[PDB]
Amino acid sequence: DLASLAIYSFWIFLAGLIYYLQTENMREGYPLENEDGTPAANQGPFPLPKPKTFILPHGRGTLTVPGPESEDRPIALARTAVSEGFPHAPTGDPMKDGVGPASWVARRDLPELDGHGHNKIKPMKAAAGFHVSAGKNPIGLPVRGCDLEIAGKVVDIWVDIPEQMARFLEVELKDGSTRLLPMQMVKVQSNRVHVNALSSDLFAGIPTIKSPTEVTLLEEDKICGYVAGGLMYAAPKRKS
Amino acid sequence: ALLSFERKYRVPGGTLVGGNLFDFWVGPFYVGFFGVATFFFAALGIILIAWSCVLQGTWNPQLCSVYPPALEYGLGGAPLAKGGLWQIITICATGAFVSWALREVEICRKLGIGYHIPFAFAFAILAYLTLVLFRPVMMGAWGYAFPYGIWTHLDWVSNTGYTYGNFHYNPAHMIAITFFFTNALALALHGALVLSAANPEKGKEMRTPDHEDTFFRDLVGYSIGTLGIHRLGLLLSLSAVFFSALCMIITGTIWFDQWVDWWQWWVKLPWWANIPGGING
Amino acid sequence: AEYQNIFTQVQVRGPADLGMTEDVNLANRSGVGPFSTLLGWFGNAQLGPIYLGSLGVLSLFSGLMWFFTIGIWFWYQAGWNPAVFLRDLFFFSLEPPAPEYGLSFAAPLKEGGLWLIASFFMFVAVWSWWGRTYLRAQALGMGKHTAWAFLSAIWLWMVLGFIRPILMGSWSEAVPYGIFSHLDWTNNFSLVHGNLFYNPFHGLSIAFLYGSALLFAMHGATILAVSRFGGERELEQIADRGTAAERAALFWRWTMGFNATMEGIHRWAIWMAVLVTLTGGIGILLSGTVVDNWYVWGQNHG
Numbered sequence: 001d002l003a004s005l006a007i008y009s010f011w012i013f014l015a016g017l018i019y020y021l022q023t024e025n026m027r028e029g030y031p032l033e034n035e036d037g038t039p040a041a042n043q044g045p046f047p048l049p050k051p052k053t054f055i056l057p058h059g060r061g062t063l064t065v066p067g068p069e070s071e072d073r074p075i076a077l078a079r080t081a082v083s084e085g086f087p088h089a090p091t092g093d094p095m096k097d098g099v100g101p102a103s104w105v106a107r108r109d110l111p112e113l114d115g116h117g118h119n120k121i122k123p124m125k126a127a128a129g130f131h132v133s134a135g136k137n138p139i140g141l142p143v144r145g146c147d148l149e150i151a152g153k154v155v156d157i158w159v160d161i162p163e164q165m166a167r168f169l170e171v172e173l174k175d176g177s178t179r180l181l182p183m184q185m186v187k188v189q190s191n192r193v194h195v196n197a198l199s200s201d202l203f204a205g206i207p208t209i210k211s212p213t214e215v216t217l218l219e220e221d222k223i224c225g226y227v228a229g230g231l232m233y234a235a236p237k238r239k240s
Numbered sequence: 241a242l243l244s245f246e247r248k249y250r251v252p253g254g255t256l257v258g259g260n261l262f263d264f265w266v267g268p269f270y271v272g273f274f275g276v277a278t279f280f281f282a283a284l285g286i287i288l289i290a291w292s293c294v295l296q297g298t299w300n301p302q303l304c305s306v307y308p309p310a311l312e313y314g315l316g317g318a319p320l321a322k323g324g325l326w327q328i329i330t331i332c333a334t335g336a337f338v339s340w341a342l343r344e345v346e347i348c349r350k351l352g353i354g355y356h357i358p359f360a361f362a363f364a365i366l367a368y369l370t371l372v373l374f375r376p377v378m379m380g381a382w383g384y385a386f387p388y389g390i391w392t393h394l395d396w397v398s399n400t401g402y403t404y405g406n407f408h409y410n411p412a413h414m415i416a417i418t419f420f421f422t423n424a425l426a427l428a429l430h431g432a433l434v435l436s437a438a439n440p441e442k443g444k445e446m447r448t449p450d451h452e453d454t455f456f457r458d459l460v461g462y463s464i465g466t467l468g469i470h471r472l473g474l475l476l477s478l479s480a481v482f483f484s485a486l487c488m489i490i491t492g493t494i495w496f497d498q499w500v501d502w503w504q505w506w507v508k509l510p511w512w513a514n515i516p517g518g519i520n521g
Numbered sequence: 522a523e524y525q526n527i528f529t530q531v532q533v534r535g536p537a538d539l540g541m542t543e544d545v546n547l548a549n550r551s552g553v554g555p556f557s558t559l560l561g562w563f564g565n566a567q568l569g570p571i572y573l574g575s576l577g578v579l580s581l582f583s584g585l586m587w588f589f590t591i592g593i594w595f596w597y598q599a600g601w602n603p604a605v606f607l608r609d610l611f612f613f614s615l616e617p618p619a620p621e622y623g624l625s626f627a628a629p630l631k632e633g634g635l636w637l638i639a640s641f642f643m644f645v646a647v648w649s650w651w652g653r654t655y656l657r658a659q660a661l662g663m664g665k666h667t668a669w670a671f672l673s674a675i676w677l678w679m680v681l682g683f684i685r686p687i688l689m690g691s692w693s694e695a696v697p698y699g700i701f702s703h704l705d706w707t708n709n710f711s712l713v714h715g716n717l718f719y720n721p722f723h724g725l726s727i728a729f730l731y732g733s734a735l736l737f738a739m740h741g742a743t744i745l746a747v748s749r750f751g752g753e754r755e756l757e758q759i760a761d762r763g764t765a766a767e768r769a770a771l772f773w774r775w776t777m778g779f780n781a782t783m784e785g786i787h788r789w790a791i792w793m794a795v796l797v798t799l800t801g802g803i804g805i806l807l808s809g810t811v812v813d814n815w816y817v818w819g820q821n822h823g
């Protein structure tokens with residue numbers, strides 16, 4: 001009977017599909033490692049997929065996955081028990097060290113480019129024709145940390161050009177230097193921008209970028225990772 | 241075993257309950273207090289379900305079923321074989337799903353990410369409780385809840401819907417279905433767009449988010465953006481389960497006749513109610 | 522109150538983005554439309570430009586024709602009384618030929634010939650529209666995923682109004698145009714065939730429809746959860762994994778013991794959704810052509 005052949009066939013197709021999908025999802029982070037980075041004995045029942053290669057645009061090279069996996073940075077963590085599967089305590093300031101929720105990745109230290117190969121993200125003051133067009137303009141507001149202290153003023157908005165969104169606030173600190181603050185991590189209120197993740201004292205902590213009018217994928221991750229890690233690590237100095 | 245980038249994230253901290261007592265992993269699974277809670281609730285439940293399936297006398301998946309207590313029992317207890325086991329298995333499941341959820345809130349804290357996922361999760365927990373708890377408790381009986389049975393629960397859906405005629409006519413059921421269809425639509429389109437960019441014509445450079453935005457704008461004259469579509473797909477599928485809970489919560493309480501008749505209020509509007517012509521006048 | 526990125530705080534607008542060019546024929550692109558501050562709170566604010574070539578005009582025309590054909594009949598059924606039109610708006614129905622006319626085109630205008638004309642315009646609209654989702658992707662160098670995914674939804678729509686009626690030897694089997702009528706047609710078909718809950722492909726189709734809601738909730742929650750790390754920029758996180766990708770992978774790893782990649786999650790996606798109508802159209806196509814009563818078929822295959 002035709003119907004029952006079809007439904008039997010389908011289930012076989014579906015298992016192959018799940019297998020296909022689950023391998024395709026192993027192109028990154030595999031093969032599994034022990035807590036010292038050696039290959040792990042039990043790799044599960046799925047095999048690594050054949051390597052695929054992406055042709056990155058704008059002469060940025062390729063990516064081939066799966067490939068050799070390497071953290072490409074030192075990790076300031078240390079075992080907390082004598083057996084696998086336990087937390088790993090930081091060995092310094094996890095905020096300063098980029099471990100934990102403060103963690104960042106060793107992404108390319110170039111900036112993301114739009115499709116015409118200009119930097120994806122610019123400050124507004126240097127983005128012709130860009131301006132705030134709805135909602136409170138945060139530029140000029142005092143930036144308040146979670147200890148309810150003022151930590152800086154907003155001196156620009158860093159905007160994505162091909163998408164036209166806000167992506168960071170640029171905050172000027174008491175020493176006159178700025179930092180970038182991810183937009184998704186401040187509350188623009190009518191008299192202030194509030195940052196619940198960091199306390200004021202921790203604002204100079206924020207990794208600093210090297211050029212004033214661009215930010216690289218690496219510099220983003222150290223800035224985003226740091227602010228977010230403040231959530232867990234500032235908490236001794238978060239009020240209410 | 242860890243992932244080739246996992247160790248740096250496996251720091252302590254983030255728990256909601258009990259400090260560092262349960263703050264460890266088991267294989268890839270993070271545990272926590274609410275990992276244990278989950279396991280208890282989920283284990284006790286699954287136990288009672290296989291032992292409810294000897295009190296019924298059946299060891300088949302296509303036949304094992306744990307029916308609620310009979311309408312006659314109203315809202316009280318009931319013997320284990322006559323509805324009591326369902327009532328327990330139901331508390332278990334609640335505990336397991338709320339545990340799975342708070343366990344997720346801990347995993348969120350330790351990773352410095354936002355609580356969007358177990359908040360999305362809440363809508364599914366809430367729809368479930370709507371069917372097994374909230375709705376039965378305004379209608380006055382656990383017997384208006386559905387059984388725990390692969391095929392018997394489907395019966396209940398047919399039996400329940402047809403009490404009110406063709407259930408299509410439920411206006412909130414309608415809006416639910418519309419979000420569900422739009423979600424699958426947004427899902428297909430989303431997956432493909434990302435994918436046709438990472439995986440272009442042969443030998444071509446990766447396409448950029450610009451190329452996605454261009455594609456849809458070229459095609460439907462709008463493009464919602466890469467942040468929007470994730471906002472959308474969350475909103476569309478949350479919305480659908482909201483109106484699912486709603487469509488069922490109003491059914492049997494504030495509306496209990498044939499859903500097709502609910503629509504007279506429009507047809508019987510006075511400025512056109514007795515105009516001749518068309519189907520109704 | 523912590524910000525959750527569900528709605529925008531500060532909208533910024535630059536000059537109009539007219540889009541990548543590649544091999545697209547720019548002669549056929551409209552100008553930029555208005556800028557909706559409204560939309561900008563959830564998504565993008567810029568409407569337009571749209572591409573409209575020959576194939577688009579054909580499709581955009583047939584569709585209006587199918588909509589208008591239905592619509593004229595709807596005015597008629599209202600006796601041209603605008604008030605009745607609104608009142609009975611969900612009750613009108615353009616209906617297919619009666620079974621005596623079989624698959625033929627002879628049936629009178631007001632007894633099915635109109636349904637067959639409206640259906641023609643729909644056929645030409647949908648299909649030429651499919652050609653659009655291909656040619657637009659080809660034009661930019663991108664893949665044809667969007668097009669193959671469409672082809673899955675086309676497949677259900679094709680089985681409901683074309684393939685099953687022809688296999689079943691009569692236009693009468695096909696779906697009418699109308700709000701309530703199409704609804705009753707559905708619930709009917711289910712009764713004629715033994716309660717479709719007994720159809721393994723209805724059950725499967727449902728699973729994916731549920732699973733599409735589960736997944737897109739899951740996915741969209743996760744990408745908003747890691748948007749504080751640039752998560753939403755999925756293409757460059759694919760070329761160059763970020764902490765966003767890493768923590769999103771590791772949320773679902775530490776929850777359900779396995780996880781996805783930033784590129785992998787979108788193959789999960791495209792298939793969970795595509796299988797909704799894929800299995801769905803098989804369950805219909807078998808119904809009445811091969812299986813008369815799913816219940817009864819389940820009694821002898823289960």
Ligand code: BCL
Pocket residue numbers: 337364365366367368369370371396397398399400401402406407408413416417420481483484485486487488707708
């Ligand atoms: C005779 C049939 C009637 C009918 C009667 C009903 C009835 C009766 C109901 C619906 C409801 C629904 N119907 Mg209706 N409906 C009909 C026709 C349709 C048609 C159609 C094309 O005809 C469609 C598309 C729908 C669509 C739908 C949705 C709006 C909704 C289902 C989603 C939902 O509730 O999710 C909610 C999702 C959940 C509750 C899942 C919760 C998951 C929990 C939290 C976790 C469980 C974990 C699990 C145990 C884990 C296992 C272990 C692990 C796998 C390892 N109906 C016809 C007319 N419909 C339902 C509804 O709205 O319910 C609220 C409902 O009760």
Ligand code: BCL
Pocket residue numbers: 397421424646647674675677678681707708709710711716717718720722723726727728730797798800801802804805
């Ligand atoms: C009481 C009635 C019956 C019943 C009878 C049927 C029948 C009959 C069918 C379904 C179908 C479906 N049912 Mg059922 N169903 C019932 C109960 C349910 C319940 C439930 C809780 O009880 C649920 C969750 C569902 C769920 C589902 C879906 C999974 C499935 C449709 C997938 C889809 O997206 O189609 C929506 C997608 C489409 C229709 C494709 C459309 C594609 C075209 C190309 C779009 C053209 C647009 C056009 C040009 C206009 C453009 C608009 C302008 C842009 C404005 N059913 C009961 C058992 N159900 C289908 C199926 O596969 O069954 C096997 C089906 O045909």
Ligand SMILES: CC[C@H]1c2cc3[nH]c4c(c3C)C(=O)[C@H](C(=O)OC)c4c3nc(cc4[nH]c(cc(n2)[C@@H]1C)c(C(C)=O)c4C)[C@@H](C)[C@@H]3CCC(=O)OC/C=C(\C)CCC[C@H](C)CCC[C@H](C)CCCC(C)C
Pocket residue numbers: 278281282283285286329332333336337340344357358360361362363364387388389390391393477478481731732734735736738739742776777
């Ligand atoms: C709100 C939008 C959609 C949604 C979202 C959603 N679901 C989620 C999440 C989110 C955001 C998770 O984080 C979580 C998850 O891990 O996903 C991978 C989950 C999840 N949603 C799931 C299921 C599910 N979601 C569904 C629906 C949806 N989920 C919505 C459409 C459906 C249906 C019917 O459409 C199902 C089946 C699980 C995969 C998972 C939750 C895992 C969990 O709770 O684990 C703890 C419990 C156990 C391991 C077992 C408990 C066993 C019980 C104690 C006894 C059984 C009780 C039960 C009542 C019997 C049911 C009988 C059936 C035959 C009818």
Ligand SMILES: CC[C@H]1c2cc3[nH]c4c(c3C)C(=O)[C@H](C(=O)OC)c4c3nc(cc4[nH]c(cc(n2)[C@@H]1C)c(C(C)=O)c4C)[C@@H](C)[C@@H]3CCC(=O)OC/C=C(\C)CCC[C@H](C)CCC[C@H](C)CCCC(C)C
Pocket residue numbers: 421422424425428429459460580581582583584585588646647648650654667668670671672673674794795796797798
């Ligand atoms: C995986 C399956 C899911 C899916 C996939 C899917 N659908 C798709 C695609 C994909 C991948 C496309 O490529 C294509 C698209 O372009 O989407 C943006 C499409 C599409 N899915 C559509 C609809 C649709 N998809 C649906 C379902 C789903 N599609 C599935 C759940 C449904 C249902 C029944 O649930 C509908 C109604 C369209 C938006 C589009 C196909 C467009 C098409 O064929 O257009 C030809 C017709 C015209 C160009 C003109 C039509 C006239 C209109 C009535 C408008 C004009 C009249 C009036 C001015 C306004 C009308 C509306 C009311 C206010 C009156």
Ligand SMILES: COC(C)(C)C(=O)C/C=C(\C)CC/C=C(\C)CC/C=C(\C)CCCC/C(C)=C/CC[C@H](C)CC/C=C(\C)CCC=C(C)C
Pocket residue numbers: 588589591592593595596637640641643644678679680681682683696697698699700703
């Ligand atoms: C305000 O009034 C005016 C006049 C301005 C209007 O325009 C009013 C307009 C309306 C009131 C229209 C409102 C529209 C509707 C209610 C339509 C509702 C539509 C549906 C419910 C869709 C139902 C599903 C339809 C299906 C399944 C169709 C299948 C189509 C076929 C696949 C096409 C097959 C081709 C055929 C039969 C023709 C054969 C010939 C060939 C050459 C191929």
Ligand SMILES: CCCCCCCCCCCC[N+](C)(C)[O-]
Pocket residue numbers: 018022043044045046778779
């Ligand atoms: C129903 C959707 C979920 C299907 C489960 C697919 C298999 C996931 C298990 C992957 C294996 C995990 N592992 C061992 C590689 O780490």
Ligand SMILES: CCCCCCCCCCCC[N+](C)(C)[O-]
Pocket residue numbers: 460461462551552553554555568569570571
């Ligand atoms: C689904 C959303 C549809 C939006 C369609 C908008 C098309 C924009 C056309 C604008 C035309 C511009 N101009 C000046 C040439 O007319």
Ligand SMILES: CCCCCCCCCCCC[N+](C)(C)[O-]
Pocket residue numbers: 135528529530559560562563564
């Ligand atoms: C699919 C498009 C959705 C558009 C919905 C627009 C909702 C408006 C809510 C904006 C919130 C306003 N405010 C002041 C909080 O920013």
Ligand SMILES: CCCCCCCCCCCC[N+](C)(C)[O-]
Pocket residue numbers: 626627628629630634635637638641
């Ligand atoms: C533009 C439509 C293309 C032709 C296909 C439509 C078939 C309609 C048949 C109408 C029947 C006419 N008549 C007199 C026999 O009733």
Ligand SMILES: CCCCCCCCCCCC[N+](C)(C)[O-]
Pocket residue numbers: 720721722723724725728729732789792793
């Ligand atoms: C791509 C993700 C795969 C998930 C598969 C969903 C499994 C659902 C199986 C339910 C059983 C349905 N049926 C028809 C046999 O009754």
Ligand SMILES: CCCCCCCCCCCC[N+](C)(C)[O-]
Pocket residue numbers: 267268777778779
């Ligand atoms: C397909 C529906 C039910 C599937 C049940 C859940 C699958 C288990 C996936 C968890 C995998 C954990 N593990 C073993 C890889 O470590």
Ligand SMILES: [Fe+3]
Pocket residue numbers: 430434470740744755
């Ligand atoms: Fe995505």
Ligand SMILES: [K+]
Pocket residue numbers: 124125126127128129130131
């Ligand atoms: K400017």
